[PDB]
Amino acid sequence: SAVQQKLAALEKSSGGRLGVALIDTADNTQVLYRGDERFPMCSTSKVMAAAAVLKQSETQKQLLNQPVEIKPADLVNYNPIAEKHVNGTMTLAELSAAALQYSDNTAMNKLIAQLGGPGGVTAFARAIGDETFRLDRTEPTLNTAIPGDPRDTTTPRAMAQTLRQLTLGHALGETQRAQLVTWLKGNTTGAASIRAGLPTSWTVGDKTGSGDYGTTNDIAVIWPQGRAPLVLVTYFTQPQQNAESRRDVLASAARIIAEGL
Numbered sequence: 169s170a171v172q173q174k175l176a177a178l179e180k181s182s183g184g185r186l187g188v189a190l191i192d193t194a195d196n197t198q199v200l201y202r203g204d205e206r207f208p209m210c211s212t213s214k215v216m217a218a219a220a221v222l223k224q225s226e227t228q229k230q231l232l233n234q235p236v237e238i239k240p241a242d243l244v245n246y247n248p249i250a251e252k253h254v255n256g257t258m259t260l261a262e263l264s265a266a267a268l269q270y271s272d273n274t275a276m277n278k279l280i281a282q283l284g285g286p287g288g289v290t291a292f293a294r295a296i297g298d299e300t301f302r303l304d305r306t307e308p309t310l311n312t313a314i315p316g317d318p319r320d321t322t323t324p325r326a327m328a329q330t331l332r333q334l335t336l337g338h339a340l341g342e343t344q345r346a347q348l349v350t351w352l353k354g355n356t357t358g359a360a361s362i363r364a365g366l367p368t369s370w371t372v373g374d375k376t377g378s379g380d381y382g383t384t385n386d387i388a389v390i391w392p393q394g395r396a397p398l399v400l401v402t403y404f405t406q407p408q409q410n411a412e413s414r415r416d417v418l419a420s421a422a423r424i425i426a427e428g429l
């Protein structure tokens with residue numbers, strides 16, 4: 169189709185490898201570009217860790233208010249919110265918000281710990297029907313994004329389906345789903361990525377990811393005004409280990425997708 173030709177052209181112009189999956193929930197139609205290739209998730213994996221903790225909170229009703237101590241040894245390479253609470257506590261809700269809205273890596277590691285390790289995050293994915301997602305490492309090493317390395321990867325198709333189930337479907341309880349949506353809508357790191365390729369009137373909830381090999385990712389739920397919502401996953405990675413981020417590619421892919429609707 170037109171959109172696949174334009175996405176291929178965008179990819180060719182970028183020098184990297186682009187993966188896109190769109191679900192239009194109006195007719196459950198899908199648009200895929202390298203939809204079944206693995207890509208390093210980087211921080212887009214934080215959505216799965218947060219959702220897993222939310223799922224736990226359906227039975228442990230007060231879990232999200234549980235205080236968790238932030239110690240200096242907990243700090244890793246990028247902790248914009250946890251840094252503000254060293255030698256203090258953050259609740260699991262606050263850690264989930266920080267992981268999602270600020271991409272805080274210390275927060276992610278605390279969520280992983282709450283789940284019993286990366287295998288606990290992966291187990292949640294399996295439990296909601298995602299056979300592709302795999303989380304293998306903690307922060308910051310899960311962002312190494314080495315070409316061909318299957319660790320800490322998923323495919324665009326799988327992540328789109330899973331993000332749909334978490335935000336628009338019923339993989340989570342009603343209050344948990346609403347909380348996740350609220351967190352995603354309040355993301356602070358996405359302004360130059362998918363959001364930049366979409367009409368300013370559309371409401372977006374998204375989670376970015378960045379890593380080595382110029383890996384530049386964004387996963388989004390999109391609520392166009394007067395239209396069924398869309399789920400859009402855009403993964404991008406490059407052949408040079410020290411390549412610069414290319415959020416403009418994600419913006420451009422979103423724009424191409426938006427034009428075809």
Ligand SMILES: *[B@@]1([O])O[C][C]([C][O])O1
Pocket residue numbers: 210211212245246271273308311376377378379
């Ligand atoms: B994710 O990808 O978003 C930011 C952090 C940087 O380590 O990880």
